[PDB]
Structure formats: C-alpha cells, structure tokens
Design a protein around this ligand. Structure first.
Ligand SMILES: Cc1cc2nc3c(=O)[nH]c(=O)nc-3n(C[C@H](O)[C@H](O)[C@H](O)COP(=O)(O)OP(=O)(O)OC[C@H]3O[C@@H](n4cnc5c(N)ncnc54)[C@H](O)[C@@H]3O)c2cc1C
Ligand SMILES: N[C@@H](Cc1c[nH]c2ccccc12)C(=O)O
Length: 629
C-alpha cells in the first residue's frame, strides 16, 4: 500500500516533499500536465512584475541559507525559476495526470484520474492551489487600451498590478468599493529601509492583546486625526470593521494590498530606472494615484448603467470601457467522498489550522491559508512540517486527532469569536500562524529560557518566519545560524521594533495612534511624501512607455476627468491644508544596544520602569492558547 500521495505540485508542496525524502517515506506526486498560472504567464512572456512580499518570507529556509545576502523584493521571474528548479529535482516522482475524485475510507483513499488510472494511498495531501477570476486579466492583458475608463468593485493585489499597468497608457481608474486596507510594503526607520513584515514583533501578543492592538491597528483602523494619513484625506478608503468579534489583532479575515511608496521606489530604482522596470519592478503607489487623481474613490452605490456602460459622477456621464468584478479565490478541490459516498463540503473554519478537515481520515490541505503580510513561503513551510509530523509520527497524529473537534472550536473562539464565516477567514497574520504551528510541533522557543536582553530581542522582535523555527531541534536546517546572524547584523537585532513596544506600554489606543503619526515619515500612507515626487513620476511614466515600446500623446487633455477628480478630492482639498516617535525610537535603540548582553534576572529594581516591564517579558501573562494546551 502507497504510504503518501501528494496531489498538486507547484510551490506549496516543495517543503513537505523534501521532508518525506529525508525520512525515506514512500510518496507519489500526481500533478496536472497544464501546470499553474505561472506557466500561463511564462509561456506568453507576461512574467514582467515583482512580488508584494520580501525574499525573507517568500523563499524557503533551505534556499535562504544559500542565497540570502540582503532584504529585497524578488521578481515574478525569480519566483517562477525557483518553482521550476525544484520541479526538476522531483519530476521523476511526479505523475502527469488530473485527479477528478477522492473516495475516503477509514485508513485509505481511492484516487480517480482523467486518464482512468486509479491510486490507493494511506495518506493524501491536496496542494492544488486556488482558481482566480482575475487571472484572465493578467494572463491575457492587452497593453494598447488607452485613454479608456475602468471601474473596479474591489481593491486587491491583482487590481493594483492591473492599475499599475494601465495608468501609464493614460487609462482612468474609478474604485466603486466599500473601502480597502493598503500598506507601504517598505518603510523607513531612522533613514534605513525595512520591508513591513520586519516590524510586526508578533510574540508581544503574549504580554497582552491590548498592547499588541496599539502596536499594529492605528494604520488600519481610523484612530489618528492627523490630516497626513490617507484614511483622513480620502475617507472612502475606510472599511466596515463591525464583523470583527475577536480580541486577537490584527484579526483573521482582514486583507491588505502591499505597494511601493514612491519615495522608497525612488531610493531603490531611480539610478537605473528603465532596466529595473523591464525586470518587473512596477510603480503601484495607490496613495500617489489618489493624490495625483489618476485613480479616484467614489461611493459604493454611485450611478452606473450596465447596458449603456456608463458611470455618472457628480454630473458628467462617463462611458466606462470595462467593469472589473473583484478577485474571489476558491480552492481547486476535486470531489472528496466521505466513506466513498457523501460529498465533502469545504469550509476553512471546519478544518484545523487550515490543514486537517473533519469526517475525512489521513487527508491534509497544504497552501489554502493566506498570510496577511509576507509571502506564502512562511505558511506552507510550517504547514509542510505539521503535515510531515502527522504522516510519519503516529503518536503526534493521535495527540492532534484525539480532540480535533475541540481544538477547532477553541481556535475558532480565539481568532473569529461569534462572527459568521467570511470568504477571507483563510487570511492570518503570519507571525501568529507560524508560532501557532511551532507550539503544536514543539519547535517553538520558551520565553522563560531567555537569559540576556539579546535573547529577549530574538524571542520578541525577530520576525516569526519559518526559518526562525529551524535553528535547532526536530526540523533543523543546516546554515540557519549563519542566516539569523546575517539578518540580526543587518537589522540592529530588531531593537527598533522592541523599543516601539517600550514606548507605548503606558499609552491608550488614541495616544499610540497620535504617537504612530508623530514621525517625519510615519510608516504607512503618509501623504506628505507624495508632492515632491511629481517630477520623478513623469520620468517614471516616460521610462515605462520606453520599456513597453508604447507611445500615447500626453499633449491631448481629457478635460472631463480633470472635472471628476475635483469632486472626489474635496475632503483632501479641505483636510491637507491643516498640515517625537523619531526621538523616542532614537533614544530607545541606543539604550537597548548598550545593554544587549546584560543578564535580565540581574537588571536592578527602582529608562526607569522600562526595566520592570523587560523583566516581566520572562513571564508574559497572555501566553495561553486553548487549541494547543
Ligand atoms: C498573480 C499572483 C501573484 C502572487 N504573488 C505572490 C507574491 O508576491 N508572494 C507570495 O508569497 N505569493 C504570491 N502569490 C501566491 C502564491 O505564490 C501562488 O498562488 C502559488 O502559485 C500557489 O502555490 P500552490 O503550489 O499552492 O499552487 P499552484 O502553483 O497553482 O500549484 C498547484 C498545481 O496543482 C495542479 N493541480 C490542481 N488541481 C489538480 C488536480 N486535481 N490534479 C492534479 N493537479 C492539479 C495545478 O495544475 C498546479 O500545477 C501570487 C499569486 C498570484 C496568482
Ligand atoms: N509595528 C510597526 C509596523 C506595523 C504596524 N502595523 C502594521 C501592520 C502590518 C505590518 C506592519 C505593521 C509600526 O507600528 O509602525
């Protein structure tokens, strides 16, 4: 009897396949001849974009230990080539066929295929990915459509890539949405670049939910009255957050587009701009788009005619070339039959950690949990370890399955509370999920085992990426010590992130909000850092048209759109003319780096109380997680 069948092989499955080879577990892969969306995009030369996620969170530990030099954003091309390098290693273990039905019995599944060949496997893993409506727009993108108007009913990472590709062909963008959360993917800390996943310090949740809330939520909830923040200048961007019924912030189910702010874009790319664009580094600055009027927010229920294909905003009858219905993603699950009879219904919440479903035996899901920030790599690596342990270690299998139903109830209560299932429940802050999986496995770190201040910074401020949990113990990867070392030396041991928590431990919700925005350049959606870059923008648009071999006439003005922008930017034209963290962080960082190697338990009683609080980090009081204990 075949021990393991993996169905679907692209990216999600790589770390699990590796672990099965290490323990010489009998496995077969079954994967479609047609391949993935990256194959569609490759064949037709449309791999001319970059990832919305850092190298550090988007590539697996066993590649990072070889190829990590510096923080950066990898190209679509690089991400694809790394898929195709790992496919080549494992191609011999891959059967090219499509699975159409799984019949699940007590201790085995019967797998049917399109060819007619059937397979018996004790353990079955789905890593088949998602069907995506928006894929057609990207794969079959026409770059001649010019001076046309587009309406989008949802803002996600796909719409933003499309918007980034349209704007330089002088196409006009209207967002008919009920708000969206956008966040600068890159951020300055005292004039040094940090990708946003570097600054989440997730284990501070263990001190208290309240303190973690103040650490993260002011850029997302409209908590500052600072006129400089996008959600004050352009209030239509704000969302309805009355669904959130969890104390865990940021909440499961919240999505975010990550984008280049133009200042960060400039710093990296201004010096070889045409070459960088051609590699796939595209300016996708949605807040620069609203500021310049090249995108406009309009209310959710604005008048449109679907037959006449027209928008009417204030009083101009705008003919719209295309309406784009937003990205809805649904798992590519084949029919699964319970006791080889009853069709199985997929619901993220009715599975444990997005991986173990109920009423099925020895079936696991790999690649169906979405990270809020950073790459999928973080989630699928830790899931691969969870799945590998369940398949190979019956003790572990028994421990998890014994009370599966209760664990799932306890997880749902902590992360979703009494909220009705939503289509985005599958989205999780990465540094909670990876940490959650690591405690179920037992490759987690113990806060009480911190000896020095250096140790506290690794436990609390060092990002909760999958490789952090592969330094030592059951899933150790050779070279992780040298990686953690390199990362720490480049980021000042994440002291700047640790000092933020120091500074706001005595503040309330409103106070932290005002403090978050007291900076020269606050982290996200700082509209003071846009006007200065109008000249560069026009250099960029010209550079894009030179790469994409396109020529529109800029000397022809669409006076009607100029008119629709004014109506839109009404609050901005009121709020903008009404236009400390830097000092606190600066003083804080120098304090921490002076006592790096000082013993915690040693540190004296009666700076000031910043000591009492650093000693309690040995005994955090929100450490309980009922789905694990
Ligand atoms: C436009 C776009 C941009 C993205 N950008 C990023 C990014 O910047 N950072 C990031 O971290 N993530 C990103 N992602 C997400 C993620 O990297 C991709 O979705 C990734 O391809 C998912 O990996 P997977 O292995 O789960 O799925 P896939 O790559 O789709 O692999 C699944 C494979 O299984 C096959 N298959 C499906 N059903 C069956 C079946 N029944 N039988 C047999 N074979 C089957 C498919 O043909 C496919 O080859 C992006 C996704 C998209 C669409
Ligand atoms: N803690 C950092 C970074 C940060 C805040 N909220 C975030 C949300 C997502 C990612 C990063 C962050 C800050 O307050 O500035």
């Amino acid at each position: 009897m075949l021990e393991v069948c993996i169905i679907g092989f692209g990216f999600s499955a790589i770390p699990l396949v590796r672990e099965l080879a290490r323990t010489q577990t009998e496995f077969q892969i079954i994967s479609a001849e047609s391949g993935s969306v990256w194959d569609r995009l490759s064949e037709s030369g449309r791999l001319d974009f970059s990832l919305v996620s850092s190298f550090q969170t988007s590539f697996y530990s066993f590649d990072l230990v070889r190829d990590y030099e510096k923080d950066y954003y990898p190209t679509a091309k690089q991400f694809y080539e790394m898929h195709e390098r790992w496919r080549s290693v494992y191609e011999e273990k891959i059967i090219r066929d499509f699975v159409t039905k799984i019949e699940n019995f007590k201790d085995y599944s019967l797998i049917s295929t399109r060819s007619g060949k059937t397979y018996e496997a004790k353990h079955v893993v789905l890593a088949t990915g998602f069907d995506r409506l928006m894929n057609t727009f990207l794969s079959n993108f026409d770059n001649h459509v010019s001076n046309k108007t587009f309406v989008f009913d949802t803002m996600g990472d796909s719409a933003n890539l499309l918007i980034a590709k349209l704007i330089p062909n002088n196409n006009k963008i209207i967002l008919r949405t009920n708000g969206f959360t956008a966040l600068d993917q890159e951020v300055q800390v005292l004039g040094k670049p940090f990708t946003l996943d570097q600054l989440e310090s997730p284990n501070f949740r263990y001190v208290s939910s309240e303190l973690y809330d103040r650490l993260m939520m002011s850029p997302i909830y409209p908590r500052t009255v600072n006129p400089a923040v996008s959600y004050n200048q352009f209030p239509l961007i704000r969302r309805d957050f009355s669904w959130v019924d969890s104390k865990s912030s940021p909440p499961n189910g919240l999505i975010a587009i990550k984008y280049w702010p133009i200042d960060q874009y400039y710093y990296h790319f201004n010096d070889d701009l045409e070459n960088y664009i051609s590699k796939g580094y595209l300016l996708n600055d949605i807040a620069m788009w609203l500021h310049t009027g090249k995108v406009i927010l309009v209310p959710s229920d604005t008048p449109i005619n679907f037959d006449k294909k027209t928008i009417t905003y204030a009083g101009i009858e705008r003919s719209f070339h295309q309406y784009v219905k937003g990205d809805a993603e649904q798992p590519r699950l084949p029919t699964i039959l319970i006791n080889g009879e009853t069709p199985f219904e997929y619901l993220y919440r009715d599975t444990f950690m997005g991986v173990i479903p109920q009423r099925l035996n020895n079936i696991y899901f790999l690649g169906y949990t979405r990270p809020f920030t950073g790459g999928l790599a973080n989630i699928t690596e830790m899931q691969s370890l969870f799945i590998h342990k369940l398949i190979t270690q019956p003790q572990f299998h028994q421990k998890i399955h014994q009370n599966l139903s209760k664990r799932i109830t306890a997880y749902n209560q902590h992360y979703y509370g009494a909220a009705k299932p939503r289509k985005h429940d599958h989205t999780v802050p990465f540094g909670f999920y990876t940490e959650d999986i690591a405690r179920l496995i037992g490759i987690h770190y113990q806060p009480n085992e911190c000896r020095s201040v250096r140790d506290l910074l690794f436990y609390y401020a060092f990002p909760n990426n999958a490789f952090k949990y592969r330094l030592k113990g059951e899933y150790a990867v050779d070279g992780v010590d040298e990686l953690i070392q390199k990362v720490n030396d480049k980021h000042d041991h994440y002291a700047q992130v640790f000092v933020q928590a120091l500074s706001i431990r005595n503040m309330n919700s409103d106070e932290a909000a005002e403090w978050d925005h007291s900076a020269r350049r606050f982290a996200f959606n700082d509209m003071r850092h846009k006007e200065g870059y109008r000249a560069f923008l026009d250099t960029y648009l010209k550079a894009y048209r030179q790469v994409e071999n396109i020529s529109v006439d800029d000397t022809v003005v669409d006076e009607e759109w100029n008119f629709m922008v004014k109506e839109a930017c009404q609050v901005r034209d009121k709020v903008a003319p009404n236009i400390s963290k830097d000092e606190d962080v600066n003083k804080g960082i120098r304090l921490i780096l002076s006592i790096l190697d000082s013993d915690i338990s040693s540190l004296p009683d009666s700076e000031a109380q910043s000591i009492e609080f650093i000693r309690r980090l040995l005994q955090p009081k929100n450490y309980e997680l009922l789905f694990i204990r």
